Design a protein around this ligand. Sequence first.
Ligand code: 4HK
Length: 255
Amino acid sequence: VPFVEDWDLVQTLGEGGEVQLAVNRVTEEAVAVKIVIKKEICINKMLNHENVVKFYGHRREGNIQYLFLEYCSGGELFDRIEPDIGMPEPDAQRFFHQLMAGVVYLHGIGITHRDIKPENLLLDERDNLKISDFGLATVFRYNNRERLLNKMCGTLPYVAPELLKRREFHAEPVDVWSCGIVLTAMLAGELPWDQPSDSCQEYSDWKEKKTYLNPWKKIDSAPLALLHKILVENPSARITIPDIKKDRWYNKPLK
Ligand SMILES: CCc1cc2c(cc1O[C@H]1CCOC1)Cc1c-2n[nH]c1-c1ccc(C#N)nc1
């Protein structure tokens, strides 16, 4: 059928290169086009899940790479978070369930995202959470053999303490930690510390269980009991996702 391959770039969605909203000339189907890499496309070709931004394909027009990705009309989770407030606890729980489904899927195929934050968690028309941007993502399991990580990747307020203290670390507890910081931000509208280091006063207060301070004071005891299990300094003692799925607040009916 003629012109079905032609796309009009209608609106800017973000900057990195850049992300533009493309509309099909014939079908009017909307897609996000990422203008820029080889690892990102390779990892994206492996992905197929309802809580992961869909990869439609790629095309190179010279030195420029075009990534055709799922357009998420609901925008970023970041913009659903009211500063210093957060969002209704039932909304945060539903987003947290969908975030866990996405992360279980990635870890199951041996992929770690390494930069989980509300800017990278997009929402479709029905407010379904989609994990976005696999530019920092890497394979941590291949031929059923786990590879320990050593590279500094991520965003300091969401990074796990072992990434700053240890030479090598397991990939999965790092993504679990960033998910707990996202959960904190959804329930309090603020990040608990600039970074998880002993030099950071806010981080020291948390390790000393001073939950009468912000952001913890704004969080109900049931989701706060979950955060006490996720934001554990020792990654070997940190709660795993199968155990998060058994948590009392995770399973609390909320309306
Ligand atoms: C119009 C709502 C909106 C949609 C979208 C975004 C951002 C959005 O918000 C706009 C509105 C003002 O600021 C940006 C960003 C975006 C969207 N769909 N897919 C993507 C998107 C972005 C990066 C990647 C990657 N890698 N994949 C998909």
